[PDB]
Amino acid sequence: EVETFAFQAEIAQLMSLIINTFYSNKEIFLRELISNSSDALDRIRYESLTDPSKLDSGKELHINLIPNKQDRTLTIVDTGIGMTKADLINNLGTIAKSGTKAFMEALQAGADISMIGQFGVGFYSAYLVAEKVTVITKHNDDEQYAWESSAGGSFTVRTDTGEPMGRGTKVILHLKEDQTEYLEERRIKEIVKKHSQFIGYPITLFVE
């Protein structure tokens, strides 16, 4: 049972801007996703101070980067706090509406796409390099879901039938045909070193 949803017009507008604007420095997507993973790892660590039981779904706090040339995917995996169905359908968009407006205001005033993370919507920078994004996520006290969107104004949510994760989020980037450089070990290493070098969690780059 797959549910189909329309993005708020403001989010659809943001995604179109990311897809349509000529902007050569696409590699910033990876910093934005790693930063989101780090923040989600922080969140579950903090929650666990008052309530140790929230690590019952996994004590290890880390990030994996998994390239796959057969599937033409780059997956960013974390064991952070995860997202609920209510998040995927309602709450993320509610919060992202404000950040999107500020970001577009800043772009008018002369900012560039590389500062998107200051507005809380760096996730959508995935669409610089991906034709489709699939998000697998599991939050304590909710089920594992698959969110998916190829932009175009809509997204889908299903209960995920795949391998159970425990707790956390997988962002699966289905890369555009001309963006397969982000599957190459040397390129990913370069980018993580340049932009994500002080992240306070292990980042494991899987080999093909």
Ligand SMILES: Nc1ncnc2c1nc(Sc1cc3c(cc1I)OCO3)n2C[C@H]1CCCN(Cc2cccc(S(=O)(=O)F)c2)C1
């Ligand atoms: N890896 C990750 N792990 C966990 N979470 C991640 C994440 N990546 C992202 S970004 C992302 C990923 C997406 C997306 C949109 C975005 I925008 O659509 C499909 O998938 N988020 C979502 C976070 C990013 C920081 C701002 N919050 C606000 C918030 C909302 C609701 C509830 C709370 S609360 O419980 O603390 F009150 C807070 C959401």
